[PDB]
């Protein structure tokens, strides 16, 4: 615990300088998420305050690309819900509580400009999908069908590439990998049902072959998702 | 799936058959123009005889 507190203090001191904070922001994209997880797990007021200060310094306006860093953190590390949970939780330390409130306000301001499309884009870039509410939201798919097909179906091509990578990674058949594969299959089925012009692009890019290969997967959920995608493709 | 790939080939064959069927309609349209030209040629020949008269 003492070593972790000293490391957090050193990280905050380094992040005090905006140049060093900006350099460390790109050094580890998951550093903010790890710090937030440690702050949530740790019950020490001083450690939580140090973690909050370090997180704020990374997203501070002094550091370069402050808005971009804040948006990336809120999109990838789920900064906004974590800050909302921390604000709901009661902290004995007054300085730590004030830092948590400031971080929550910053996260809310960053998420106000952001939308579900930005979150979907970040999830696609990170190649991580865990059945997001936009995936199961019919209205979100209806309002984002044109966006997916935009730029010569750039989003559709990215989804096809992610599905191909998951199929290549399907040998491991990990639980997270299986969930990602199922989410990708559901997204492909939605993008085929709505604006079927992307179906031809997916077929040219081997999306149909990937779905057929996933139809023989050992996992029951993956097989069911692949069967549903095939039915949406040419099935009744 | 190997069977699914064969089904895709059947779909491609159906698309090829559909393209051939569409080509047959285009070929019929091309033959339709030739048939109309023959009818026009007969009328032109009759008109030429009237001009000669």
Contact (Cβ atoms closer than 8 angstroms) between residue A124 and residue A162: yes
> Residues A109, A103: contact at Cβ < 8 Å?
no
Interface with chain B: mutation pick from A206, A208, A235, highest number of B CBs within 10 Å: A208
Q: Are A72 and A123 in contact, with CB atoms under 8 Å apart?
A: no
Residues of B in contact with A204 (CB under 8 A): none
On chain A, the residues whose CB falls within 8 A of the CB of B4 are 208, 212, 215, 230
CB within 8 Å: B1 and A234:
no
Find out whether A222 and A184 touch, Cβ atoms under 8 Å.
Answer: no
Interatomic CA distance for residues A160 and A185, integer angstroms:
9
- Residues of chain A in contact with residue B1, where contact means CB-CB under 8 angstroms, are 212-213, 215-216
Structural method? cryo-EM
Q: Compare all CA atoms of chain A with the CA of B11 and give the residue at the minimum distance.
A: A234
Do B5 and A216 lie within an 8 Å CB cutoff? no
> CB–CB of A132/A119 below 8 Å?
yes
CB A130, CB A87: distance < 8 Å: no
Q: What is the DSSP string of A161-222?
A: HHHHHHHHGGGT--HHHHHHHHHHHHHHHHHHHSSTHHHHHHHHTTHHHHHHHHHT-SSHHH
Question: A212: which chain B residues are within 8 Å (Cβ-Cβ)?
Answer: 1, 4-5, 8
Distance between CA atoms of residues A230 and A235, nearest Å: 6
How far is residue A94's CA from residue A102's CA, in Å, rounded to a whole number?
Answer: 12
Cα–Cα distances in Å, from A121 out to A131, A185, B51? 14, 17, 77
Q: What is the structure's resolution, reported in angstroms to one decimal?
A: 3.3
- The owner of tokens 């069977």 is B3
User: What whole-number distance in Å separates Cα of residue B19 and Cα of residue B30?
Assistant: 16
Secondary structure element (H or E) that encloses residue A122, with its range: helix A116-126
Nearest-10 Cα torsion for A45, A49, A51, A54? -170
User: Using the beta-carbon criterion (under 8 Å), do A216 and B8 form an inter-chain contact?
Assistant: no
Q: Residue A132 gets which letter from DSSP?
A: -
- Between CA A214 and CA A70 the distance in angstroms is 37
End-to-end CA distance of chain A: 60
What are the chain B neighbours of A203 within 8 Å (beta carbons)? 8
CB proximity under 8 Å: B 6-45 to A: 7-8, 11
Closest CA to A188 of A151, A158, A229: A229
Name which of A162, A234, A160 is nearest A202 in CA terms: A160
Determine which helix (DSSP H) or strand (DSSP E) holds A65, and give its type and residue range. Answer: none
């Amino acid at each position: 615990i003492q070593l972790q507190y000293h490391s957090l203090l050193l990280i905050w001191l380094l992040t005090f300088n905006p140049v060093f904070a900006n350099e460390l922001v790109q050094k580890y994209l998951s550093d903010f998420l790890d710090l937030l997880k440690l702050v949530k797990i740790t019950i020490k007021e001083k450690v939580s305050r140090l973690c909050i200060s370090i997180i704020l310094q990374c997203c501070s306006t002094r550091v370069k690309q402050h808005k971009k860093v804040i948006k990336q953190l809120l999109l990838l590390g789920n900064a906004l819900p974590t800050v909302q949970s921390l604000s709901e939780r009661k902290y004995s330390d007054e300085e730590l509580r004030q830092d948590i409130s400031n971080l929550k306000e910053i996260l809310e301001n960053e998420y106000q400009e952001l939308t579900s499309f930005d979150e979907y884009v970040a999830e696609l870039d990170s190649k991580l999908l865990c059945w997001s509410p936009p995936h199961v939201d019919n209205g979100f798919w209806s309002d984002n069908i044109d966006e997916f097909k935009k730029d010569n179906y750039k989003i559709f091509r990215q989804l096809i590439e992610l599905l191909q990578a998951k199929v290549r990674n399907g040998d491991v058949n990990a639980k997270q990998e299986k969930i990602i594969i199922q989410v990708a299959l559901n997204d492909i089925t939605h993008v085929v049902e709505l604006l079927p012009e992307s179906i031809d692009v997916l077929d040219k890019t081997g999306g149909k072959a990937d779905i057929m290969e996933l139809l023989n997967h050992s996992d029951s959920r993956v097989k069911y998702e692949a069967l549903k995608a095939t039915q949406a493709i040419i099935g009744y | 799936n190997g069977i699914a790939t064969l089904l895709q080939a059947e779909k491609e064959a159906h698309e090829i058959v559909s393209k051939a069927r569409k080509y047959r309609q285009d070929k019929l349209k091309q033959a339709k123009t030739d048939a109309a030209k023959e009818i026009d040629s007969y009328k032109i020949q009759k008109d030429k005889e009237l001009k000669e008269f």
